[PDB]
Amino acid sequence: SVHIGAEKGQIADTVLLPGDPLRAKFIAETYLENVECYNEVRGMYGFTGTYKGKKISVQGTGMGVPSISIYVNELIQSYDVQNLIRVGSCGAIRKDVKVRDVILAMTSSTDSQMNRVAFGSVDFAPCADFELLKNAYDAAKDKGVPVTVGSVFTADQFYNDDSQIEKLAKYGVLGVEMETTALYTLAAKHGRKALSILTVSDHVLTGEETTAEERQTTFHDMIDVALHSV
Amino acid sequence: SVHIGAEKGQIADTVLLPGDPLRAKFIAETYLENVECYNEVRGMYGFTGTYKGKKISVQGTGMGVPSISIYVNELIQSYDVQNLIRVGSCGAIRKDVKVRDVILAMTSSTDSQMNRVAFGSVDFAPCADFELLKNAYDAAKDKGVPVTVGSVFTADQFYNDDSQIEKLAKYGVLGVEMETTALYTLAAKHGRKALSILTVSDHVLTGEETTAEERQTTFHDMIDVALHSV
Amino acid sequence: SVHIGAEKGQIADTVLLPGDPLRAKFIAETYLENVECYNEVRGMYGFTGTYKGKKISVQGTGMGVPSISIYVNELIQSYDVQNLIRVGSCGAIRKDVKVRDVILAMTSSTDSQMNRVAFGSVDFAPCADFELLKNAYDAAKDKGVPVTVGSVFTADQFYNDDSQIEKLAKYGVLGVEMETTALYTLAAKHGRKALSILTVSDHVLTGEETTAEERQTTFHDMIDVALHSV
Amino acid sequence: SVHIGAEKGQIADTVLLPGDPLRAKFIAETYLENVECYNEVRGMYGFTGTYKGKKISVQGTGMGVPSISIYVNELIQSYDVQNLIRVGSCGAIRKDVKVRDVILAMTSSTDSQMNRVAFGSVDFAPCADFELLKNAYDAAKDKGVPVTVGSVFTADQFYNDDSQIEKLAKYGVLGVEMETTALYTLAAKHGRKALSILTVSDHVLTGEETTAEERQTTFHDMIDVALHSV
Amino acid sequence: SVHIGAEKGQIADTVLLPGDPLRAKFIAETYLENVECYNEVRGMYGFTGTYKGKKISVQGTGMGVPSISIYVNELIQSYDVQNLIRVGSCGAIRKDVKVRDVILAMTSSTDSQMNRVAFGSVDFAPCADFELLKNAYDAAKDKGVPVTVGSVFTADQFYNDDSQIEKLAKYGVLGVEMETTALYTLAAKHGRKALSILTVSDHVLTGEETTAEERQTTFHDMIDVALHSV
Amino acid sequence: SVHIGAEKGQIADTVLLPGDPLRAKFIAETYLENVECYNEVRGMYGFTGTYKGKKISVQGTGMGVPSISIYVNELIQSYDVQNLIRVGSCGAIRKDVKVRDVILAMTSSTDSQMNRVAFGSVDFAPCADFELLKNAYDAAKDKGVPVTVGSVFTADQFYNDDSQIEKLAKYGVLGVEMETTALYTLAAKHGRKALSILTVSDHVLTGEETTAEERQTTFHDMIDVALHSV
Numbered sequence A, B, C, D, E, F: 001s002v003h004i005g006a007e008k009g010q011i012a013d014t015v016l017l018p019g020d021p022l023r024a025k026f027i028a029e030t031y032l033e034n035v036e037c038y039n040e041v042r043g044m045y046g047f048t049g050t051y052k053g054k055k056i057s058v059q060g061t062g063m064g065v066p067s068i069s070i071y072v073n074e075l076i077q078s079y080d081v082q083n084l085i086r087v088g089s090c091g092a093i094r095k096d097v098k099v100r101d102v103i104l105a106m107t108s109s110t111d112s113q114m115n116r117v118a119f120g121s122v123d124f125a126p127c128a129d130f131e132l133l134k135n136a137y138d139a140a141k142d143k144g145v146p147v148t149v150g151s152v153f154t155a156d157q158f159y160n161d162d163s164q165i166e167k168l169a170k171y172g173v174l175g176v177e178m179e180t181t182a183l184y185t186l187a188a189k190h191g192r193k194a195l196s197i198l199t200v201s202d203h204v205l206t207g208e209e210t211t212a213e214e215r216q217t218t219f220h221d222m223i224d225v226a227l228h229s230v
């Protein structure tokens, strides 16, 4: 495939998808054994390692719907990947989402036009694979890792001068990020399993940041949920 | 309220929502003790009874997004209803959806403009309350009731001449019905808990029918799952 | 047909369509001779009687576009019905529409998505059958029954927090109701004759109600116009 | 006003509106006594004359929604015109529309965004003034002029390569022209009376032409109906 | 063709398109030698003359997208025309566009629905032929005629009570007119060369007019650029 | 700023914008003297160097409208960047687009909702700064670099299953890429200068590839044109 330079059989059945290729590197190194680098095209790193005797791959996706779609389409069409777990951050848009909460997205709203192009008059609602969702949940509960399940918003512009997040928060939407709708749509289109697991990097509505130490801890919990759930 | 003839106290915090009021009569008389009919307005029957120490109301909602929105809005705003569970039928659009499986809807797609009117350029994805969904799933598993968790399509036209169902099935959508998007959207906006539990009444994309016997079996499984949920 | 339990030849050529199955009963009883009940599916009653030697049928339709579409499609496809006259109420949105005015809808605007799904880039304008419209008019004039002819709005949500009726009233629109656009569209699609005859139940913009005695009188005039015009 | 060179008093309360200004010259000189030309700006000719004791103006409007909107807006706002009657040609899209029948447009569909820009999520259905329509119908019947009352489609493209006319004919739409939606919308908003009277200049969906002789006959019937209307 | 009464070989390869048939006459007379009138249908004049040994034609187009489309389609389909140069006026919407500036439109935005009908989910951007644009530019520079290159807005309603020109001016849009998007779209669709050359008739945002003497001078510069560039 | 790790002074007023950061490294090291890397955040590399007496920065932007919008917004708002030139690849969609021609984009079509979200009912046509475009064209001509000036399509999906490219080619669109609309829109809104220069990396509508040798030749022509432009 064009944006991925792996050989046949270099990419595992299960894949973690951070947005940042440097986090992909960071995860692969810290949690995986016997790591090889299978992709360097565009500096968008993909690694394959073992975690307790199972092969996992970790591939940066880039930022935004178009960018993740490319990687996901190529991981599905060219490398036959089965499970795709986005591991990422989001901006919380409601006061009741807390900085240590790991978020499991059941679904995502979006102002991306991707699905409108596909389905004209239908509001298409992307859906997580329940089996993946359930296993992530059960592994968080098993540990006492605090988890919230609900919906996110896949924004097409990071900076927004029309930003309608205020209305979305009234309807229960937990947070805003940029990839989830693409993952869930293309996964389901191809009969594959996807889930997004997200931590809070900020509170969008007040402007409040979360401290570097809090982020490090939730990032650990997130990768641990994704790995244990596999 | 305009369409519900109940007096203060008569309607439970928890309400089951079939489309068919005759089915509401049936549900009420079969599974609940100490039943009163609190509404006759428009023949759209609603009953309250007891089930294992808890108040339950059962309210026919009619067919289509506009009809159930009227009933849900009134139940929420005038009767401070907290938990809303739609129990009904739907058309399977995929071969691997079997006639025995009870469906729990995580989310719903729609070609209803209800949400495009409220949101503008956003594709809003309505979402189930995870807690109701998890309790319903756990109670299905407790009894070994067969369950499938995924997404549905909420149509405005039973008879859809330009039908896009062929494409929705390709995106993993399980089934078609006519109420779920409105239920989930309105519940969410008012911070209340909603879930839709559905049975297969036929296969849309082959035409074939389900026997009177499959139908009432799966209808039984569906009501027990809902009641045992709460 | 699925939602209608009539036998072949139980439904007449001309049909009155109130929204409320209990009004269908009320009309059938009060104005018709030799009444039989041909439908009880969903408690959505349909009766057939004679009025001055002509067979008429009267069938509740439910509330909202999806609900009326089902009945209308089945009355047209399965029972070969020729004339369909909706008899109903609407909320007046302009001061110059008076409580005793019987309304003949020539056309209807709508925020329903039904026609947008059908016709993508066209604003489709549903149209009443002139012959029916003319005969209703002539029968009101013959009696001195006061009539106003113009357009209505077919709303998809009864309660509206985006409600754009204020702009519609500036453009001459007389009132708001929930079924007319579906009737007129499907009738015309199938080469059949439809008309909606409406009375004012309220003034939406001020909040003013109309007294029970006024409603009883206009309801009589409405059914009388529909019957005499047949 | 920008596009009309008339001085106070010169333009009648009642105005006929052909698209072709040469046809406006023809109408003016043939049917009216005591004619003055009040506008030459853009060659878009407009005349005033007398007909049986009444002032009539006759104004070419050009072709398309934007052109006639300019003229209608100015006529309404600057010259306090009360009654606006478009008289023109259109393409028949249905076999049962005959070349002799004069068309009275109750309403018009459009693929013009004029109304989607003003309304948002609403499909606005422009409507004729019933009184003008009824007077025109009564004057056709008085002379036995053949008349058909229904709806038209107002196109933005005479030559429409992705044409949806095939579907519009299936919904009972009689004909295609290029001005009516704008006329009815603008009249309605300013509380003035508008009607469109059209003749068939060919059949769009067979290609065939109407003879020079049919054309001028039906053109005569059309002008007499309009003039005898007021 | 229907709206044009020219004979085979009466219309030249290069055509100037003013909106006003009386300006077409004015241009033909003043700048062309050996002028003949080839079209009088609808008083929409087209003339053919010579300018320094080359045949040019000059054809009024009318006002608005639908009107220009008709002429352009017929000039392309029926008369094989190769180059089409709109010569017109526009309302400036930014302070930095000056009254003596000749405007070369590289592109145009529009609220016309024409391209949305054609291309559903694509924002289509019409484009000028660079060769024509370059030659117009070079001929203005050669003379010291002051020129600005950028984008315009093709409005569908001259008078606008929703008018969104304020936002367009923030995005660099220079002016508003009514034809350009149609020309550029149909030209390019048919493999032909189009360019619009515009002068400022007014400042829309303040209300300031430009004097009659200034307009006469810029109109000269505009025709001179169009002719020299040919 | 969030995604760029530069300190005050490090980023030039003029910035080249490849999609591929490895290509940004390549461009920086090959053509510029005195290079520092000012950003490593997300591996999305950005460098500053000198070229013939002028500061140039070279910044990878990633793939897709959302990714380049983040980078352009930050460059504009935090680093007061004045001139923004995208240099990259695109897919040719027309036979007469040859693999040697460098493309200068006058404008871009899009199926991105970015602009429909900001504008509503308007089709916004993003436009290049003519001065940058003219300087780039003049520098191509100075060296005889083959150049084609026209319009591109900015897609949200590299892999577009319902693809409308067949129609866009019929309207004279040259090529497909994934960034240009965002670049031109954002530059324009902030009153800065933007241009996109593209090379052909394959023909989309035949499938065929361009040799490694054509590719690097045309890549050379593209960078010289951009650098010699400023």
Ligand SMILES: Nc1ncnc2[nH]cnc12
Pocket: A089, A090, A091, A155, A157, A158, A176, A177, A178, A201, A202, A204
């Ligand atoms: N504030 C934000 N907006 C959009 N996407 C984000 N991802 C993480 N934080 C975000």
Ligand SMILES: Nc1ncnc2[nH]cnc12
Pocket: B089, B090, B091, B092, B155, B157, B158, B176, B177, B178, B201, B202, B204
């Ligand atoms: N076939 C069908 N279409 C729409 N709604 C349905 N509910 C059950 N079956 C259905």
Ligand SMILES: Nc1ncnc2[nH]cnc12
Pocket: C089, C090, C091, C155, C157, C158, C176, C177, C178, C201, C202, C204
């Ligand atoms: N107020 C109202 N709104 C919508 N539909 C109605 N039908 C009758 N009254 C109505």
Ligand SMILES: Nc1ncnc2[nH]cnc12
Pocket: D089, D090, D091, D092, D155, D157, D158, D176, D177, D178, D201, D202, D204
């Ligand atoms: N064929 C046609 N298409 C559009 N408008 C018309 N007016 C008359 N005939 C027409």
Ligand SMILES: Nc1ncnc2[nH]cnc12
Pocket: E089, E090, E091, E155, E157, E158, E176, E177, E178, E201, E202, E204
């Ligand atoms: N003010 C204006 N609005 C729209 N189009 C125009 N053409 C010239 N002036 C104009």
Ligand SMILES: Nc1ncnc2[nH]cnc12
Pocket: F089, F090, F091, F092, F155, F157, F158, F176, F177, F178, F201, F202, F204
């Ligand atoms: N074929 C293609 N599709 C989309 N973007 C591209 N960029 C280069 N080639 C492309």
